[PDB]
Design a protein around this ligand. Structure first.
Ligand SMILES: Nc1ncnc2c1ncn2[C@@H]1O[C@H](CSCC[C@H](N)C(=O)O)[C@@H](O)[C@H]1O
Ligand SMILES: Nc1ncnc2c1ncn2[C@@H]1O[C@H](CSCC[C@H](N)C(=O)O)[C@@H](O)[C@H]1O
Ligand code: NA
Ligand code: NA
Lengths: 318, 323
């Protein structure tokens, strides 16, 4: 059962990558620089032989590659060299006590018809409520989300004309990095961000609204953006968000759904689908499923545009 | 389109494969997947009161990682993952340990354990006690761990009996034998011997054919046995702690007596042995060893290496004598 034992012990890959990132030595691996294990251990005060053993495993799983009298990050794993990279922040969330405690309650959550989220069962609060009481975890999560916007922003500005819109609300925009990046290219607009803040953010070019899209969505916007929001929610909660958007919107107003649309048979989509179930009782959805939500909320699909293998844009109207 | 960082993101999210396998095992449904049976997702969901769509979405991911395969009526276990059908399999019990809060929190502190100035295991930094002391105060975690180890013996017993004549011996001590399942399985084939097990017990087990001894192999090993078995013990320990166990064995043994070292050897450059090397570091500041490194421990402890025989790609038996 060599394949089954490889699958069972898959978590050991995530935990050694976490350990590498957490040691704060990634700065020295930048631009594929060849780092000497001995020089690194002496500098940091690390156990040489034990750190060497870690490096050998990181080579075997393809994070590190052997270089002349040392080790370097593989080209595919170069992002780990930057501690503020999406991938560096992602691993901190992935093997967090928040995540693995939530995962432990997944099996229990699947048996219960009107289950609380596996996360709520584990922690006594739903995911976004929990973020209010955990500054460090929220900071890491919000920054991780901001770096996700950085990865698709170039492709986004190409395939959709944002200049046609004058009043733009980022619904669940968090730090508001989407509108920060859009603002860099598109100036002289009204940019607003709706989210839940302990302390409401302040920027010169972006307005921030401390609210709750289950209570109401602000009216007076001709574009409503929902990036990586819908997949956080059950069908009932998703419809309630779209319904609140509908009550806010006049007949000419646009909704942009930005995020994963299930179609390409990718493992990262399937695995993220199960994580959304664990954390939020959310899901990744097929177009027809998103279409069904849209219709029920009183919208129609006007257009679909592919960003990449993971992400598409869905333009809603009415 | 892009696939920017897809390989790194796959490695980062690798733990999701462990946690869905845990969830599948923990649901206790694998019995319906026995003998490569084709399972209808809607029927199983109905029978157990599962949310049909949530359970179908789990099954889809399990197909993608290779645990399940499509059949005409729904899903079957892949031949490769058929062991998950048995809820008492080594693999079923392994995943319970692998994604235990004990392991997760130990892994969190691995980065802090590697600092030269420190001498504590990542496990002790996490839990405030070392691994084996922690077992004493946590019955559920100990039960899963001891059960996991017993099933490891079930996997190798057939091959082990084929490559070593246990019938030649009269008195056999299983040093760190836990539940004593290695001796239970030997006793089924080879009868009339004196079988004893040494380990740390809150309640000393009782069996008709097997004697259980509550002890500490760092203090002393019971004398008067002609075979001492150290199965999956050496890799738990530093060189000095390993030599101390072997020294206590030599002091206990007469000139005629045999030690059998049974365990994992670094031979074929296997990812699983490399990953277990790191796990042994995280839990116990232990390590996996090359054959020459094991020979060196034996020699330093004052033993002759008399025979080496392969069980499989991971496991070997090393026979030690005093002469
Ligand atoms: N009730 C609520 N009202 C407003 N925002 C909410 C909310 N519940 C969750 N959110 C926000 O929804 C966001 C989901 S994560 C996506 C963040 C951002 N749109 C991006 O794509 O990067 C988080 O910022 C979270 O704080
Ligand atoms: N000081 C000590 N004295 C005796 N046994 C000990 C010990 N420290 C650890 N052990 C035991 O060493 C074993 C390691 S796991 C190996 C279990 C068994 N021999 C098998 O192969 O399946 C555990 O059962 C643990 O309880
Ligand atoms: Na769900
Ligand atoms: Na099961």
């Amino acid at each position: 059962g060599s394949m089954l034992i490889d699958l069972i012990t898959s978590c050991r890959k995530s935990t050694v990558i976490y350990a590498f990132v957490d040691m704060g030595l990634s700065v020295h691996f930048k631009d594929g620089a060849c780092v000497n294990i001995s020089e690194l251990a002496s500098q940091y005060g690390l156990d040489h032989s034990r750190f060497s053993r870690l490096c050998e495993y990181l080579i075997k799983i393809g994070v590190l590659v052997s270089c002349n009298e040392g080790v370097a990050l593989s080209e595919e794993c170069s992002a780990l060299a930057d501690p503020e990279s999406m991938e560096s922040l992602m691993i901190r969330c992935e093997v967090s006590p928040e995540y693995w405690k939530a995962w432990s309650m997944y099996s229990k959550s699947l048996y219960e018809n009107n289950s609380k989220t596996a996360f709520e069962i584990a922690h006594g609060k739903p995911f976004f409520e929990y973020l209010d009481h955990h500054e460090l975890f929220r900071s890491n999560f919000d920054s991780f989300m901001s770096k996700n916007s950085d990865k698709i922003i170039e492709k986004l500005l190409d395939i959709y004309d944002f200049s046609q819109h004058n009043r733009i609300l980022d619904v669940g925009g968090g730090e508001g990095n989407l509108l920060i990046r859009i603002n860099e290219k598109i100036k002289g607009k009204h940019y607003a961000v709706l989210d839940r803040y302990n302390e409401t953010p302040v920027l010169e070019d972006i307005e921030f609204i401390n609210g709750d899209f289950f209570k109401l969505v602000p009216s007076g916007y001709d574009l409503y953006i929902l990036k990586n929001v819908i997949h956080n929610w059950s069908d009932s909660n998703a419809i309630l968000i779209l319904e609140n958007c509908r009550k806010a919107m006049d007949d000419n107003a646009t909704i942009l759904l930005i995020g994963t649309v299930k179609k390409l048979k990718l493992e990262i989509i399937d695995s993220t689908d199960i994580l959304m179930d664990v954390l939020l009782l959310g899901k990744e959805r097929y177009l027809n499923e998103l279409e069904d939500l849209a219709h029920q909320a009183g919208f129609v699909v006007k257009d679909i545009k592919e960003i990449n293998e993971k992400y598409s844009i869905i333009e809603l109207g009415v």
